[PDB]
C-alpha cells in the first residue's frame, strides 16, 4: 500500500541520462568530463568516501584524478594545489575530502576553490547563492533528496515539511530548497533539533518528514500522520546499515518512503556526478 | 502589562557604546571609521535610504563618503569603483545602494565587493558564512532583530519561533540566526509564506513571531498565544507608518512587542553602524 522512493532505481535512470549526454558530446569530438579529488592523510573512512566517488565516475563515463598528500602537507602547498586545479582546463570540477588536519584552515582551503568547479557545493558562496536563489552548485545530499521528490512528482506546494536536524550537510540546505517557490518547494518548513521539546507533536503535523538526526529508529509510527512522505537520511551501522526511521511500523503509514539502504545514498553519489557534468558544460543548474 | 521592545532606546545605548570605542581609538591617535556609499540614478526612495545612513554616521562619529553615478554608468565603471573602494585603506566598509539599473548585473557588482568591507552583508559569501556558522557580516535588519532579543535577555532556547515571510532581507537570515546554538537561538523554526495554508494555526503555537510580510494588520489577536514575543518588521505607509501587527489588540497579549515606528527600524540603522565599526577594527563579529 505504501510506495518506495527508490533511490537505486532513480539513480540508475540519471546515470543513463548522464551517459547519453557524454556519448553525444564524444560523437561531436569532445573529451569526457573530469572530476579531480584531493585527499590528505590516510583516514579509512574518507578513503572509502573517495573510492565511492571513483567508482561512480567509471559508471557514468567520467575521467577521474586523485591526489594524495600526507597529513603534514602545509596550508601553502594545499592552497597551491587548489589554485592549480582551478586553473587546469582539463579539470571540470574538483573536491577536497574533509576533514583536513587540525593545522590546515578548512575555510581558507575551501574558499580558495573556484565556485565554477565546486561540485560539492561546499564553497560558502554557493551556500549563500542557494539561500538567496542565485545559480550555484547545490551540495550533493540535499540535491539528491529534492530530485527524489521531483522524480515522483510529489505534491509539495502548501505542504508542511518537518526537517529533523539542522546540519550543514542536510537539514539547512534541504530546508532552503523546499522553501523556494514552485514545485518541488513552496513547503511550510519546520526545522527541529536537540532543543526542540515536542518533536513527536511536530512530526504528527508533517506532510513530509526529512529524518536527518543520525539516530536509529528515532522516527516511530506514533509520530507519523497517515499519508506522510518520509525521507530517511540516517546512515548508522547497527548489530546492518539502517536509517533514522523504524521502517517496519512507519512505512505502512506512508504514501512514500525511502528505504535504507537504497534510498538517499545512491541519490547523493549520482547528484555529485550530475554537478560534475554541469560543470563540464559551464553550468550550475 | 506588556513590555516594549524599545528600538529607539536600545539603539541609543549602542550608539553611545560605538562613540566610546571611537573616542578611545581617537585618543590613542587613530582616525574615525569611514563608511562609503555608491548610488546610481536618482530614485527618490534609495535617495532617502542613503540620506538615513549619512545621518547615522554623523551621530556615531563616522566619516562618510557618497559617490553618485548617473544610471547610464557601465558595468565596467561600476566594477572599477567597487575595486577602488576594496583597495582604499581609508574606507573601512562600503555599500552599493540597490536596486541598480536593468543593464547592470547586481550579482556581479555585489560579488565584486571584498567580504571584509561588505558591511551590508549582501555578498553571497557572507550569506553563506552565516548559514554555515562561520564569521562574516550579518546583514543589518536580522542583526538588529536578534540584538533586540539579546538585549532583553529574552529566553529563546527550546522556544517555537514562527517567521512570517521568506524574504532574503529578513525571513531567511533571522531564521538562520535563531537556529544557531546558544542564546539567542536554539529556537525551533517554522517559516511561513503565501502558500502556507494555516498561518493562524501556526501562529497560535508560537512563542516568538517575526512578522515580516509587509501587510498592515496581518497579525491579529486571535492568532497570538498569551505571553508571546512579537517582532514587527513591517513598514507600510497607510492613511501613518505601521507594521504587520494590529498593535491595539495584539500587544496586550504579549510578554514583549516591538512598536512601529520605534522598534526594528532604529535597530537596522544602528546595526549597519556596528558592522562598520567592526570592519574598521578588521572584525566580522
HEC profile of A95-162: EECCCCCCCCCHHHHHHCCCHHHCCCCCCHHHHHHHHHCCCCCCCHHHHHHHHHHHHCCCCCCCCEEE
Please list the residue range(s) of chain B that carry CATH number 3.40.50.10860: 29-114
Q: In this structure, are strands A208-211 and A160-164 parallel, antiparallel, or unpaired?
A: parallel
Helix (H) or strand (E) segment spanning residue B208? strand B208-211
* Residue A7 CB contacts under 8 Å (≥ 6 apart), including other chains: A144, A148, A258, A259, A262, A263, A264, A265, A266, A267
Please list the residue range(s) of chain B that carry CATH number 3.40.50.720: 140-265
Burial class (CB in 10 A: 0-12, 13-18, 19+), B123: buried
d(CA A43, CA B8): 55
d(CA A232, CA A242): 9
Identity of the residue in B131, B192, B195 whose CB atom sits nearest the CB atom of A131? B131
CATH number, domain B29-114: 3.40.50.10860
Q: Which residues on B lie below 8 Å from A196 (Cβ)?
A: 158, 188
Is residue B97 flagged as an active site residue?
Answer: yes
Q: In this structure, are strands A34-40 and A241-242 parallel, antiparallel, or unpaired?
A: unpaired
Question: φ, ψ for residue B184 (rounded to 5)?
Answer: -70, 140
CB-based contact B196 A188, cutoff 8 Å: yes
Q: Give me the half-sphere count of Cα atoms (radius 13 Å) on the Cβ side of residue B89.
A: 1
- Contact between A176 and A130 under an 8 Å Cβ cutoff? The reply is yes
Please list the residue range(s) of chain A that carry CATH number 3.40.50.10860: 29-116
- Contact between B231 and B184 under an 8 Å Cβ cutoff? The reply is no
d(CA A139, CA A123): 9
Q: Which residues on B lie below 8 Å from A131 (Cβ)?
A: 127-128, 131, 168, 172, 176
- Contact between B23 and B273 under an 8 Å Cβ cutoff? The reply is no
**Could you tell me if residue B118 is left (phi over 0), alpha (psi between -120 and 50 degrees) or otherwise beta?**
beta
Which residue from B145, B123, B126, B144 is spatially nearest to B134, judged by alpha carbons?
Answer: B126
Mind telling me the catalytic residues of A? 53, 97, 120
d(CA B110, CA B131): 18
Helix (H) or strand (E) segment spanning residue B191? strand B188-192
- Contact between A136 and A284 under an 8 Å Cβ cutoff? The reply is yes
d(CA A45, CA B150): 41
CA angle in degrees (0–180, nearest 5) for B249-B251-B257 = 150
d(CA B256, CA B151): 12
Is residue B120 flagged as an active site residue?
Answer: yes
Which residue from A3, A56, A65, A62 is spatially nearest to A36, judged by alpha carbons?
Answer: A65
Mutate to test the interface with A, among B105, B125, B137 (most CBs of A within 10 A): B125
- Contact between B232 and B216 under an 8 Å Cβ cutoff? The reply is no
Which residue from A174, A170, A171, A199 is spatially nearest to A185, judged by alpha carbons?
Answer: A174
d(CA A231, CA B106): 37
The grid coordinates listed for B2 are: 506588556
Q: Which residues on A lie below 8 Å from B192 (Cβ)?
A: 188
The grid coordinates listed for A80 are: 597551491
Query: Residue for cell digits 503565501?
Result: B194
Burial class (CB in 10 A: 0-12, 13-18, 19+), A67: middle
- Contact between A101 and A74 under an 8 Å Cβ cutoff? The reply is no
| Residues 41-60, chain A, touching B (beta carbon < 8 A) | none
- Contact between A245 and A257 under an 8 Å Cβ cutoff? The reply is yes
d(CA A194, CA B183): 14
Mutate to test the interface with B, among A98, A105, A121, A124 (most CBs of B within 10 A): A124
- Contact between B229 and B255 under an 8 Å Cβ cutoff? The reply is yes
A164 DSSP β-pair partners: A192, A211
If one counts every other C-beta atom within 10 angstroms of the C-beta of residue A249, the result is 14
For residue B180, what is the nearest residue in chain A, using CA coordinates? Answer: A166
d(CA B174, CA B187): 11
Distance from CA of A187 to the nearest CA of B (A): 7
In this structure, whether the domain defined by A29-116 belongs to CATH 3.40.50.10860 is answered with: yes
From the candidate CATH numbers 3.40.50.720, 2.60.40.10, 3.10.180.10, 3.40.50.800, the one assigned to the domain spanning B140-265 = 3.40.50.720
Amino acid at each position: 500500500t505504501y510506495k518506495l522512493l527508490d533511490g537505486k532505481k532513480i539513480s540508475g535512470e540519471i546515470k543513463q541520462e548522464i551517459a547519453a549526454v557524454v556519448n553525444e558530446l564524444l560523437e561531436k569530438g569532445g573529451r569526457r568530463p573530469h572530476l579531480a579529488g584531493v585527499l590528505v592523510g590516510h583516514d579509512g573512512g574518507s578513503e572509502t568516501y573517495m573510492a565511492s566517488k571513483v567508482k561512480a565516475c567509471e559508471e557514468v563515463g567520467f575521467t577521474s584524478s586523485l591526489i594524495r598528500y600526507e597529513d603534514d602537507v602545509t596550508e601553502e602547498e594545499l592552497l597551491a594545489c587548489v589554485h592549480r586545479l582551478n586553473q587546469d582546463p582539463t579539470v571540470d570540477g574538483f573536491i577536497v575530502q574533509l576533514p583536513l588536519p587540525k593545522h590546515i584552515d578548512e575555510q581558507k582551503i575551501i574558499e580558495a576553490v573556484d565556485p565554477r568547479k565546486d561540485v560539492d557545493g561546499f564553497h560558502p558562496i554557493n551556500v549563500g547563492r542557494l539561500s538567496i536563489g542565485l545559480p550555484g552548485f547545490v551540495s550533493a545530499t540535499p540535491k539528491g533528496i529534492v530530485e527524489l521528490l521531483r522524480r515522483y512528482n510529489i505534491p509539495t506546494r502548501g505542504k508542511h515539511c518537518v526537517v529533523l536536524g539542522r546540519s550543514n550537510i542536510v537539514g539547512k540546505p534541504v530546508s532552503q530548497l523546499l522553501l523556494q517557490k514552485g514545485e518541488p518547494g513552496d513547503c511550510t518548513i519546520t526545522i527541529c533539533h536537540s532543543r526542540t521539546p515536542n518533536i513527536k507533536e511536530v512530526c504528527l503535523t508533517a506532510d513530509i518528514i526529512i529524518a536527518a538526526l543520525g539516530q536509529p529508529e528515532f522516527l516511530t509510527a506514533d509520530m507519523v500522520k497517515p499519508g506522510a512522505v518520509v525521507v530517511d537520511v540516517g546512515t548508522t551501522l547497527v548489530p546492518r546499515l539502517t536509517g533514522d526511521v523504524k521502517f517496519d511500523e512507519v512505512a505502512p503509514k506512508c504514501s512514500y518512503i525511502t528505504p535504507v539502504p537504497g534510498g538517499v545514498g545512491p541519490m547523493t553519489i549520482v547528484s555529485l556526478m550530475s554537478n560534475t557534468l554541469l560543470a563540464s558544460k559551464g553550468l550550475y543548474r
